[PDB]
Symmetry: C2
Subunit: 291 residues, 2 copies
């Protein structure tokens, strides 16, 4: 069901690190006005790692409140402990989230069967649509297409965010699934191609700063309009590269501060974008017509 441009939203913070509730409310409003189709609250780009459990609950609560039913809200509820993933996922269900996004357990490297059991335990514990999320470069683990295809058989498991950026592999996954669950790109550089190949949307970093552009790229790609998807994506292609010059969300948070939309807060061990990269990032925003 959830389709189109799904922003992996940052969590705006004041200089001391506190959540900037005013800026967040404004950012959600702007996404809705510009065409973003859905918001992932407190995922990787929203610094899930350095927000407390109460801060997760509050950010999800506020985004749902401001959205006011206009678009679906997906809560990031991943953990590397199955028991913890369950508690987070239950809390998101109770807050009224439309779905949960659950990165594979990171750092502890479960087996493929361990991945299967982890997600099946969560699906069986919480009645809420769940979206798998594979990002092997961050986690230390790769949820294979074979394991994804198995998990798609579990009630409540409704999609996977594939951040491999490996388009032949994502095509092979979409073809094997034959509709049984959704595939979302988690790689802005190749998302337009995965959507042209049958992905249901793009859970996007770039949409944080170009929401109207990315909403258009997703609509034309989902519609299978290859030329329009190529042309529209080309206008923002350089943004997809520059937003990872340091680990996301470091650059995207700097881009939003340059746009005047958030302040500079970001939580250790993350750091504001290194000084040397701020001019090149400004130049990319200017080239793109964003500032």
């Amino acid at each position: 069901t959830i389709q189109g441009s799904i922003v992996a939203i940052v969590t705006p913070m004041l200089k001391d690190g506190g959540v900037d509730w005013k800026s967040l409310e404004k950012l959600v409003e702007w996404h809705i006005e510009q065409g973003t189709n859905s918001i992932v609250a407190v995922g990787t780009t929203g610094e899930a790692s350095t927000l407390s459990m109460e801060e997760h609950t509050q950010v999800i609560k506020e985004i749902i409140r401001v959205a006011n039913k206009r678009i679906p809200i997906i809560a990031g509820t991943g953990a590397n402990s199955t028991r913890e993933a369950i508690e987070l996922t239950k809390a998101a269900k109770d807050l009224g989230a439309d779905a949960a996004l659950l990165v594979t357990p990171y750092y502890n490297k479960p087996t493929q069967e361990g991945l299967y059991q982890h997600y099946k335990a969560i699906a069986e514990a919480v009645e809420l649509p769940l979206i798998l999320y594979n990002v092997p470069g961050r986690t230390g683990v790769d949820l294979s297409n074979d394991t994804a295809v198995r998990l798609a058989e579990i009630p409540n498991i409704v999609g996977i965010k594939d951040a491999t950026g490996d388009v032949p592999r994502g095509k092979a996954l979409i073809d094997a699934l034959n509709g049984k669950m959704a595939v979302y790109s988690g790689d802005d550089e190749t998302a337009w191609e995965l959507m042209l190949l049958g992905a249901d949307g793009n859970i996007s970093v770039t949409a944080n700063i170009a929401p109207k552009a990315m909403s258009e790229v997703c609509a034309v790609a989902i519609a299978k309009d290859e030329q329009q998807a190529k042309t529209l994506n080309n206008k923002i292609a350089n943004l997809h590269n520059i937003l990872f010059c340091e680990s996301n969300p470091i650059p995207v948070k700097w881009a939003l501060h340059e746009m005047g939309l958030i302040d500079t807060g970001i939580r250790l061990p993350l750091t504001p974008l290194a000084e040397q990269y701020r001019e090149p990032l400004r130049n990319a925003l200017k080239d793109a017509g964003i500032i």
Copy 2:
């Protein structure tokens, strides 16, 4: 200062995953009797990821209580949030831990400067000996030798566990530090090599099942006896390989179970060692004279 065989001890668990307190006490006792030189409590091999905050404290307190100051106890206190690491490290100091072992933030991929600020902030917040821990395959980030060398200048940063298994790089790190802080192997397969080159010990998985033999390997290797180090390590070299046929601590817990020392409990998303590996494991243990 802490030298020798430092076991990264498992956290024994009952079938239902509850911590097995009696079996943990017995293990701590057997290590001390067998010649183990120090214990890391609630590290990666100890399932830090799946233990609650209260359980992290109880396990630390129990290992300290049982060891009764006969050997230094190092508390695993890493987190991917600098705030949470400071909290865990303070708690370990308060419980009487001799040192803390802090893996680089995983999953959120800080920059080298963010890793520097992370550990600087902890060292300044907590007056306790800190050991860095780099294992890039699990965490998605690699703390470079250059960054390690900067950090060794910071007062209470007293060492690093280098789990790269890359011996020339570990030698380059030892050489560059020139004694400013300790290097510990985090790779059983190469640990004897790294200690012959100047590492102060081995923060060891294999020591969970061969604590006497690994105590002797570390001692002769630290003594720079290359022949005896090689000879002694050969007897346990196949154990270093077999204990990683699925992600540690999966194989090591199974081994301790075959030895009659712990029950099969292990917490999702980890799983009990797959059946196909159990007979080979058992044969390796028989071959090494462990069972």
